[PDB]
Symmetry: C5
Amino acid sequence: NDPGNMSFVKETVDKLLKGYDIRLRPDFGGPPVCVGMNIDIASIDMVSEVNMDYTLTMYFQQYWRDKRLAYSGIPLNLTLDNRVADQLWVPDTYFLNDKKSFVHGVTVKNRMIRLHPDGTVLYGLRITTTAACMMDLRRYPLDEQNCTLEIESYGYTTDDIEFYWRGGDKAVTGVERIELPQFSIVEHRLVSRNVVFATGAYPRLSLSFRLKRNIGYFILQTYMPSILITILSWVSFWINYDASAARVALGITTVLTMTTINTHLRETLPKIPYVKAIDMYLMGCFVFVFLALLEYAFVNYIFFSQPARAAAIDRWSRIVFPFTFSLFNLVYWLYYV
Amino acid sequence: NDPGNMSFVKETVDKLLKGYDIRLRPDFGGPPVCVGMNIDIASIDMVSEVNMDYTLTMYFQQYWRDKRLAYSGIPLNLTLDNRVADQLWVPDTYFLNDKKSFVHGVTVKNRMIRLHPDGTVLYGLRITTTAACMMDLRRYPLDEQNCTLEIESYGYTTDDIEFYWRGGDKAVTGVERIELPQFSIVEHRLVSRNVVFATGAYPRLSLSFRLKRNIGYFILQTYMPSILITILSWVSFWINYDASAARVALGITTVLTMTTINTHLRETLPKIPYVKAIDMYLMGCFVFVFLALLEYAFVNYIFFSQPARAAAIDRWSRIVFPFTFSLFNLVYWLYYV
Amino acid sequence: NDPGNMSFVKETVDKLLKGYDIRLRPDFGGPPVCVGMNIDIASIDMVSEVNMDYTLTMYFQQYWRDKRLAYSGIPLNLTLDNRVADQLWVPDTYFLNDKKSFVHGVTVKNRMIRLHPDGTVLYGLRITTTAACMMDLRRYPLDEQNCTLEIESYGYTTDDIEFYWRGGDKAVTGVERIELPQFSIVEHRLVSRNVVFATGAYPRLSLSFRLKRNIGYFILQTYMPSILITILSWVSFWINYDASAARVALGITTVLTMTTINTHLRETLPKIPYVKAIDMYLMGCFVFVFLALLEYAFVNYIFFSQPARAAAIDRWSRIVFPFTFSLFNLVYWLYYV
Amino acid sequence: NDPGNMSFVKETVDKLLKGYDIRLRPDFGGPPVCVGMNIDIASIDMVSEVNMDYTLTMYFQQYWRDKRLAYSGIPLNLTLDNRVADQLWVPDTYFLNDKKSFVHGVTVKNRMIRLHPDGTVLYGLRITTTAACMMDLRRYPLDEQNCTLEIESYGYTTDDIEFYWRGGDKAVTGVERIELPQFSIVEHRLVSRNVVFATGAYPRLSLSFRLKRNIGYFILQTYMPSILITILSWVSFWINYDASAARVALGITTVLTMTTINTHLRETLPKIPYVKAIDMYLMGCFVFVFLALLEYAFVNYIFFSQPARAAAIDRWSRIVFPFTFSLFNLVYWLYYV
Amino acid sequence: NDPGNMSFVKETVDKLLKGYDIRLRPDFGGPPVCVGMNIDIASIDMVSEVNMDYTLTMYFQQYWRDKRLAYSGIPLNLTLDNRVADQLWVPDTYFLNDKKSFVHGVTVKNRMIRLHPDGTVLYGLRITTTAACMMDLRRYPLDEQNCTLEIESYGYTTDDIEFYWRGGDKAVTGVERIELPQFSIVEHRLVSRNVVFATGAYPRLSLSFRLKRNIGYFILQTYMPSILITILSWVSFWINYDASAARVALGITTVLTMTTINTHLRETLPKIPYVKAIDMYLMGCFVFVFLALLEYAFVNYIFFSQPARAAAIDRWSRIVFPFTFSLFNLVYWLYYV
Ligand SMILES: *[C@@H]1O[C@H](CO)[C@@H](O[C@@H]2O[C@H](CO)[C@@H](O[C@@H]3O[C@H](CO[C@H]4O[C@H](CO)[C@@H](O)[C@H](O)[C@@H]4O)[C@@H](O)[C@H](O[C@H]4O[C@H](CO)[C@@H](O)[C@H](O)[C@@H]4O)[C@@H]3O)[C@H](O)[C@H]2NC(C)=O)[C@H](O)[C@H]1NC(C)=O
Ligand SMILES: *[C@@H]1O[C@H](CO)[C@@H](O[C@@H]2O[C@H](CO)[C@@H](O[C@@H]3O[C@H](CO[C@H]4O[C@H](CO)[C@@H](O)[C@H](O)[C@@H]4O)[C@@H](O)[C@H](O[C@H]4O[C@H](CO)[C@@H](O)[C@H](O)[C@@H]4O)[C@@H]3O)[C@H](O)[C@H]2NC(C)=O)[C@H](O)[C@H]1NC(C)=O
Ligand SMILES: *[C@@H]1O[C@H](CO)[C@@H](O[C@@H]2O[C@H](CO)[C@@H](O[C@@H]3O[C@H](CO[C@H]4O[C@H](CO)[C@@H](O)[C@H](O)[C@@H]4O)[C@@H](O)[C@H](O[C@H]4O[C@H](CO)[C@@H](O)[C@H](O)[C@@H]4O)[C@@H]3O)[C@H](O)[C@H]2NC(C)=O)[C@H](O)[C@H]1NC(C)=O
Ligand SMILES: *[C@@H]1O[C@H](CO)[C@@H](O[C@@H]2O[C@H](CO)[C@@H](O[C@@H]3O[C@H](CO[C@H]4O[C@H](CO)[C@@H](O)[C@H](O)[C@@H]4O)[C@@H](O)[C@H](O[C@H]4O[C@H](CO)[C@@H](O)[C@H](O)[C@@H]4O)[C@@H]3O)[C@H](O)[C@H]2NC(C)=O)[C@H](O)[C@H]1NC(C)=O
Ligand SMILES: *[C@@H]1O[C@H](CO)[C@@H](O[C@@H]2O[C@H](CO)[C@@H](O)[C@H](O)[C@H]2NC(C)=O)[C@H](O)[C@H]1NC(C)=O
Ligand SMILES: *[C@@H]1O[C@H](CO)[C@@H](O)[C@H](O)[C@H]1NC(C)=O
Ligand SMILES: *[C@@H]1O[C@H](CO)[C@@H](O)[C@H](O)[C@H]1NC(C)=O
Ligand SMILES: *[C@@H]1O[C@H](CO)[C@@H](O)[C@H](O)[C@H]1NC(C)=O
Ligand SMILES: *[C@@H]1O[C@H](CO)[C@@H](O)[C@H](O)[C@H]1NC(C)=O
Ligand SMILES: *[C@@H]1O[C@H](CO)[C@@H](O)[C@H](O)[C@H]1NC(C)=O
Ligand SMILES: [Cl-]
Ligand SMILES: [Cl-]
Ligand SMILES: [Cl-]
Ligand SMILES: [Cl-]
Ligand SMILES: [Cl-]
């Protein structure tokens, strides 16, 4: 009779849990129970190309109705201590593609249960999850990635449990507040579908983001140092061919410098082994400095016999190398845009 | 009647827990319960730019009143074993921006419960928490950071629970004893406010520090080696231009040395990819050594035809390079102070 | 009488667990209980040569019959909450070669129990396991690996429990969907056998894959840089022998470049210490550049006394080195194919 | 009556735990309970300068008297299974400066409870703890460190619990058996005191060690390579000044070699950023090789105009550089001893 | 009467656990209980010189008799579910030198309990343990190590529990199947003894292995590259002394190459700081290349004044350096064999 009477509320709640069976879903043997889900994305911790995964922190909320929990006489929504969730049936929701997830537990287990007079249950969890994201890094670092989060029921088919995004397209919030230092989020989508398996159709909810990488860092730290070394290799062309020590030292040191750039960048670059766009550019620049030293090899071999022809080779090399390298840049960036 | 009678105290405490409901907050259905909080900061373990987080160890204390726990006849404050906290209602306090936190449990769970005759509860926890701190590292290593710790109730709105800093501005202690090897704490602030959400206003407490990085290490290990290499590149100007091997070797080795400095520092520097102030300085010095070798390319090309003009270019380069580099230093440090 | 009557189903299930003993296997003291197993491979997280292990995520399902759990009157398959599995006997199945495995527990423990009227139990678990895989890396990176997963009963012999692959060769699914960036799966096999131990025969199930490594990355990043340095060393042969500084600098810098390639690749290469095929090729190329500099040592020592003989040595070196290196390549790749 | 009668001992122990309250300390409301502590140090796992902590494994024993546990008729000390400790009051002892600690649990929880007829309790735990140790590394690697372990009661003041070292100065054993590869233990001290806090005085026990680092490794691997490069730079002085290519190459390569030593040592050196003694020596040697190349710059500029003065500068440089470097060594080692 | 009657077996087992006290050892107050132990070594995961520990996976079995568990009428050995071990007394066996150990728990806790009619208990556990192994690495990488596993009772003295190796020298199996990529096992020993402590003698079992490292990897990757650089330094002796640029560049580049070998190997070598045999060889080779460049310093200083004496120094250096280096190799390998 009195909502503020704590003794009466204890009697009301104990009546709900008297005879309550946690092993049975609501409306057992009848129509499936519809569970609505909405996510408040706290942050995206990291996106790892080496491990092919990303880490996500979110507020995961589930919304279903259990008529066994309906109470009367109290015109209020009962927010209960999170330890009562162990005494109730909850959906066996799991993330299909997650690798390691947990529920925060400081200072208490980050969980909330809110009851409603008609039997509706609001069930919230603060979850940090690492989900697998297979990344196509052929265009690295100019790549665009699409990482998803799959939500499914572990043991119940669509004859028992159905999923939907509560609130429509606005079910997932906090996407605009995500601050990824390396990526920029382009779009996010919410997909609801049933997936047919051996044991029957299973409810499925999908949340996906499209990530576009920021290339500003790689231009300054990776492409620019390699270009300048390639430019520096062409200095040998304008050096007089009689100076054997100067042009050989200049040619071989640029090759030495190029290898140091290549070898040390591999430590900073992702450890995943296969061909990438950045590797094609770095190897392309190494070929040019390799051919620049070979150019002087031909000139130095024929400088004594045919000075006019040796000088002619050197003069043309002052144009072919800048033109071919610029032509190589044109085709490379057009193919990677 | 006798405070020292252990049997009587057991009877008194068991009476308090007889009929006690942990699922209901104090004054359920009535005015919100006010929870006072104070923090004793044990230490700040680390501040990570790569992970964008910091680790904090603290004594977290909560102070509320529960009239269900009021006892009479014992004019003493009852300090109970920490296992009794599981038999009482405690606030569902959590840290909004934490990534991984735990309560120490050696040799026992680091927790204390103290009861008072009027029903007041003192609840302490020793917590190590890793909290996310988004760092703006454009001015790295001359950056100044502001890392916070957000405290909020997980399931209760301001109609049920209210937060305040117990003791005012002196609620948080131990800040002056924090010893960060890399940072110096400038100020800390305590903020109390209510944040409006979809489900209503939520109590919020904020503790923030301002961190100023120490630049002494970077001057000796990063800026000084790069400056001296740039100074060493200008030695080629005073070397006679006829010595083709000497000036070419000197010019190309400084470029080789500069790349080794750049590549190896990236391992020591933070792994976060984007433009930083230190990167601008390192790349700026590489341009100067790159142009120093290009300067001899022009001189060596025209030394035979116009010795006077080639010598004139060399003479002016002994002034422009020191002046431009000093001018570059002036604008760089003024823009980063 | 009514399948949709939740109260009747609770009575039926409680009758099954009344007097049920979890310490005794089904048909205790009689014929062994046959447990059928099928695996749905979610993914293969990683394959580590340094740790000699691979990480696997899968849906592990076990299928046995317990006549103590037979129920009548309900013509339906009872899917129960996963917390009921603690109240039933389950096989003590473990993975023989695993190093670290766990069952996912977000948002609930990833586990399902399904009962059938005849007493059959379907028991599913989502398990991430790290299994030891001893790899023969003599042919690295042209190696082919065979990693297995051994399934055995911990405490029961074949007189008590028997294993079989439920569904035959189609028991394990999802192998075709595995996407390993570095490896390609060639075949998988299912083996069932009994292994005789000291305490008797034990049931055993084996799932093995054959992995073939992708060599495309190593050709571009490891073999190609080393070959080009070896080619660049032969440039000294066509350089005139009077230029002492040029040929010595060219010869010694290629050795310097080769060491930098060798030393830095070790960081990228697996940390396991022993002889590998890639090490033989890298050391072979170092011998050629080492002998190239020794070739000029002989020429420079006898150029003054016998110019004709010194020139003859240089002329033959322009053929022997390309021929021997090509001959070395022919034998190397034939032995490693 | 019969000590060997297992049934009688069960009756005696069950009588002690009948009515026993774990929430109340012994002599509740009366004099404080004195807890004696002794530690058997198993090992010191590691000492980390990067993390500013050390790892310790020890046998932690606590010794107090509880008259509620007094028994008569059995003239024996009852060693009970470690699961009985959960049914008894134990001190809330914790380590003030620990970062991560645990109690070993294989094959059982490493814990022992021994009862005595007068009510005395012996309570042992095998604990591995990581304790914070703030290290002053200005004199690194010639530093001497003092790492402590603070022991305190979490919730009880000196009015309730008092601490003392059981056995006096011999309370802590196993210090002489500690084998640190990098450090040598000089002394250890045991301190007992009461620390006044806001809520009153708290018992405190302190165990501290003084660690002296071993410098033999750094002499061979760090100081010796840098000294020899500095010695090698002076070779240019005895080289004839007409050889422009030789002295420039020798001077610039020593600078290149010095940077490689500096950059690569940072990976092996601790990652903590600030000035250290080793950094001063490495930077000092770089200045000498930097000035050695500048010395030839002056000589090469004036060799044509004033050969006598240019030769005079070279002759004096053969003495000033060895003398200044030796003078630099004298002041450096005297200031760091 | 009927072994196959599951109801009768439940009655028999429940009778054993009726009145059973887990806090008391078998034959409490009487003769000590003898516990037999045998180990089936599954594998040795890794041996870490940096952490001074090794990881071991094994089947740990304990064999004792408890007359309280004797049953009659069932002529069979009762294999029970592993959850019954929590209802029985088990020895408090722990590993003295372990650092981190756990019992596998997928799909169940890897544990078995087998009862016998006379009261004998067979108790098995699958344990992965990391045990501390102090390694003497003065002879690294030609070192031979002896790693042990100490087994002891935590709380019981020899008056209560006694240990023995069940099966004699054949108690530990699977040693011959251990496959360490870096080490080869020479011998293993089983030791049983009582260790006298302050509180009395304690039972102790010791299992130790002798490990011999494989040096094949270090010969190819560490010793061979350093030897060839030292050989390459002697090329300067046969180069004509008039070529100042050639011999200086050759001498200083070998020093540069040697430092790169030394610095980069430290990353691959163990991080433990102190003198090792490999460090002596690497530093010895650096002295030879250091003295080789100093040899030309003397020759170049006196070539103009005394060409005959300068040539004489060069001629003798072609013999002393190969002889001293070979003499250095002879003493080094004899002292390290
Ligand atoms: C990252 O990558 C993933 C995987 O490719 C992308 O996920 C896909 O997203 C698209 C939408 O952008 C999904 O397409 C939609 O699927 C809905 C569900 O499909 C189920 O139901 C339909 C029948 O309704 C069945 O045919 C189907 O088999 C499933 O059972 C559909 O309802 C949608 O249909 C709507 O649009 C079509 C036109 O496209 C209309 O004709 C319809 O009337 C209706 O309006 C639609 O087809 C697709 O299913 C998702 N794939 C998966 C595997 O889930 C992410 O979008 C991507 N991320 C980003 C940022 O791009
Ligand atoms: C990775 O490496 C592992 C280990 O080498 C390979 O595993 C082996 O796989 C082969 C099959 O490819 C297995 O061979 C088969 O074993 C079955 C079980 O053996 C038990 O039972 C037989 C009697 O039936 C006993 O003799 C034996 O001792 C065992 O107790 C056999 O039933 C199979 O026999 C079938 O084929 C033979 C011909 O080969 C016929 O004569 C038979 O009639 C019958 O049709 C067969 O012998 C082998 O046992 C596996 N080894 C282990 C240790 O399990 C993986 O295959 C490999 N991975 C890849 C991808 O290659
Ligand atoms: C690593 O660094 C720590 C911190 O600096 C060192 O710890 C200190 O150790 C010294 C001893 O070496 C301690 O000094 C002793 O403290 C005792 C306790 O102090 C309490 O009680 C006294 C009154 O008795 C109060 O004044 C005080 O405020 C405390 O409440 C004292 O009892 C000792 O006094 C004894 O010596 C003095 C002379 O020194 C005599 O006059 C006295 O009569 C008596 O005999 C003494 O003062 C010091 O307290 C420790 N500091 C801390 C913070 O605990 C470690 O020693 C160091 N490690 C190594 C290896 O050097
Ligand atoms: C790695 O390093 C460890 C530590 O050094 C080695 O462990 C030692 O192994 C040897 C055997 O190889 C052990 O020696 C034996 O110890 C037994 C137990 O000693 C207890 O009991 C005896 C009395 O019986 C007491 O004197 C002693 O103090 C102990 O209380 C002895 O019973 C053995 O005696 C047998 O041999 C001797 C001759 O050597 C005969 O005279 C006896 O009659 C009898 O037959 C023997 O002394 C030694 O105890 C171990 N040390 C430790 C600390 O446990 C490992 O062997 C090594 N690993 C490898 C692979 O080498
Ligand atoms: C029990 O705790 C209360 C609260 O800490 C103590 O009350 C304080 O008493 C001091 C004086 O001793 C006052 O200065 C404070 O203002 C009081 N605080 C409050 C909230 O009342 C009380 O003294 C303690 N009881 C005992 C026996 O120590
Ligand atoms: C509060 O509810 C309890 C339980 O129904 C009841 O006994 C009590 O009388 C109520 N309070 C009042 C003031 O009536
Ligand atoms: C202590 O309290 C108990 C419980 O109220 C009571 O039975 C006992 O008599 C008290 N002690 C004394 C000495 O009265
Ligand atoms: C449902 O089953 C319960 C338990 O057997 C029974 O008491 C109840 O009457 C059943 N429902 C109906 C509508 O009969
Ligand atoms: C052992 O103690 C029990 C409990 O006190 C008692 O019933 C039994 O008789 C004792 N044993 C003997 C031989 O008296
Ligand atoms: C099996 O044992 C139970 C318990 O002792 C007994 O009641 C039952 O009669 C036995 N079975 C048969 C067939 O006698
Ligand atoms: Cl957490
Ligand atoms: Cl802890
Ligand atoms: Cl998980
Ligand atoms: Cl452990
Ligand atoms: Cl495990």
